[PDB]
DNA sequence: ATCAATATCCACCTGCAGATTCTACCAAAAGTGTATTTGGAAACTGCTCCATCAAAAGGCATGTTCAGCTGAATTCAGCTGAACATGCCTTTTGATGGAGCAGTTTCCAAATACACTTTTGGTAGAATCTGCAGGTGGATATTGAT
DNA sequence: TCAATATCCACCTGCAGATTCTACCAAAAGTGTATTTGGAAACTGCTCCATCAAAAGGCATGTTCAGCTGAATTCAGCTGAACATGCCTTTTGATGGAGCAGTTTCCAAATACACTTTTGGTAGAATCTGCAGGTGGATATTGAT
């Protein structure tokens, strides 16, 4: 009885469905909070954050990366691939006007 | 003194005409504010709120729930053409995205 | 206090994978994780720099949600849900 | 420490369109954000409209033109309808 | 008889028109297109000549920019020929 | 009136955009895109013109229509 | 003495103040605000005219024309970002041909 | 009657390039540019004063607005020249 | 890789048409001086939230192995789009009146501002109410097979 | 078809979060008067539109074929799937106490307003420099070795 194994991509497609059906934040909270405070302290030392300010930043960042990954995915599919690569991200940001 | 009747009541509105007028005056848009501007504006804000709450309530029913959450607002907005353009550059916190998988990603 | 360093690495490979899945991505090149970290750091710096500018103008030491909402709005990315 | 919001008005409209349906506070914050954003968009367009025409007053007709500029299609059509109705009822 | 190879004249034209600034659509066809589209909003309208010219400048800048983005989309797919699917990708990503 | 935007003019626009080879289906597509653009711009310009109770769309009306679409145009103040 | 003279500026401080007052931006306008604003506008104008003159020289010409303004703005990192969504009538584009389109 | 910045842009041109001229179309572009940056800055400063429940736009609002609207080195030099002008004006 | 032949490009030129400056006048804008008011900065202070820390449970990151399947490279042809010659017709250029718009000006009726007083809708918090967060379990659906 | 695995979809109940109620009070409404403004009437130039024509030069068309796009085919190595291990995020909770907000007072800085001086805008006349098109190579490209 050979051990069970899903074919490459079947689990990826399940994950796409599960995560497109949900709305929870997808980055861990505390690491994101430390990233925010690190970047802020390199602008003005000894700043403080309302918790809702950090949560607003996390919502903003996650929406932005999900939108950019949609655009990246269309760029990869355009090149008749299924694997997104840095040149797809770079194309998406050049066309969006972000670089 | 005359019995006070709210401006929203005489306009037939749920949104507060007086507060909208105060906000226009203190928002430094023009030196003067016509009497009709806050009424029209409150009417429009109420109409759009009604549109969105209508569609969001239907979405909450479809998913077997009775309280509207951000996800229902997001589903309502992105599934409606005109709201989706109006709110084209808007992020609905906790809204998620619409299920959509490019056809070429599916197996044969 | 305590020295905060390299927190960009706390955006794990699995978290980036989850975000890409929500974006409909089925297969991810191995170089994507670092690129994603670079782009996220640029985005975050731009938003946080403007939020802090608002915070300094009001002579505060606490970044409020409204500072972040204003910073976002002026960058063309309106966020609903964090007023008041 | 008083803090105003549109919450009560959004809720009255909710009881109008879906009588037995409720709303979570995060969704209420989203609706408040929406009301403030569309207010600013319309007020800003009307302010510019009056400024372009060297007028000092924002009237319902500046609000109307602003509505036509910012809203898409059928949404603008029905909004112009409800705004005209309110102004005409208010005048009488 | 003398003949240039496919693409040599294309690159000559790219150089010539990227060095220049004259409008590239002829004026009268554009004025007629503008007036037709306007007539579909309120007939018997009038145009300052400079208004028609502002429209033409806006349209040409828009299409030239869109073609830069499209050309990059084509090259991304390892082509050198722009196709409608390239235009569509550029506009989808631009948010149009 | 769209067909009056010639294939050679579209090639010229494509060349300024750096395009070397043009598929035969680009031209109709380009016209469609141009048409949407023009309608949107003109729809707003005329609105400004009607608000001012004018019958002549001015250069400033077109600049306002462009600006509100996030496309600032210099040279026509 | 004009305020522009007292600030060491060429741009018109009084006009900037009238424009601030007449624009419905705030009910009051401080005295330093139009001075600061005119200084900033002059500085940016100087930057762009500097670069446009250098570009017009590179092309052996004496009158700055829109083309030199487009060249000046698009070849500079920070101005090109400031004017990112701005169309300069009669400006053309920067000469740029993708490497993969060239022969050899 | 009909205002523009042409005389001032001309003065600044003769400052940085004494021997160079400018066409009326290029001058129109400069005018549109001055009006555009003016509106951006004044509008940000207006929003700033409203956010902080203040009725006066002061040089400190113009400065913050410049820091928000200009990129990097441009913001630094603009804040610099604005501070320079204001201090020179106060005497 | 050179070579001569062919076709388009590009400095260089010069007069002059038209665009950019001299000329001169003048409303409106900018400045000045004086008088009067006021928004907000300073200095307090109560009291929210914010920072930090802890334990402990268990979810999730990490690190590894390894095979399926994808990207990359390569070959080939059929079909599409470039170049070119040709000659016809759309555009450009210019003119012509003159209808009909913009842009002004004056003057009152109608509209809006704004202080004070009265009233009441809107908010904060307390007190009820109640979906749904999670947790559990079977039905169904899908998957990959050897 | 089958075994393994995952998803789907009702059921259950307590409590965290939402809804309702209550009472205070801040702000809207009413009122009265002062101030601003919009439009009906009457003008006056001045832009655009309608129309016509000559003729210039740009475009439409049809043929040939160069070479590009897409298909077919091959292979190696990377990325996805599965698993163990154990770190550190999440959760809940408490504690100081920073620093937001909330108040009060009072000037530095703003507005108001009368009056005066300067200047930017404007339109014509009088001067200067890019442009038409020419020339003259000169630069690049092409087929042929
Ligand atoms: Cl890459
Ligand atoms: Cl009104
Ligand atoms: Cl296609
Ligand atoms: Cl000031
Ligand atoms: Mn640091
Ligand atoms: Mn006084
Ligand atoms: Mn006070
Ligand atoms: Mn493949
Ligand atoms: Mn062949
Ligand atoms: Mn009551
Ligand atoms: Mn559940
Ligand atoms: Mn009270
Ligand atoms: Mn002068
Ligand atoms: Mn020439």
Author numbering:
A (entry chain E): 36 to 134
B (entry chain C): 11 to 118
C (entry chain F): 19 to 102
D (entry chain D): 32 to 123
E (entry chain A): 38 to 133
F (entry chain B): 25 to 101
G (entry chain G): 15 to 118
H (entry chain H): 33 to 123
The paper states:
The basic structural unit of chromatin is the nucleosome, which is composed of the nucleosome core particle (NCP) and linker DNAs. In the NCP, two histone H2A-H2B dimers associate with one histone H3-H4 tetramer, forming the histone octamer, and 145–147 base pairs of DNA are tightly bound to its basic surface. H2A.B is a rapid-exchanging histone variant in cells. Indeed, H2A.B forms the NCP structure with flexible DNA ends in vitro.
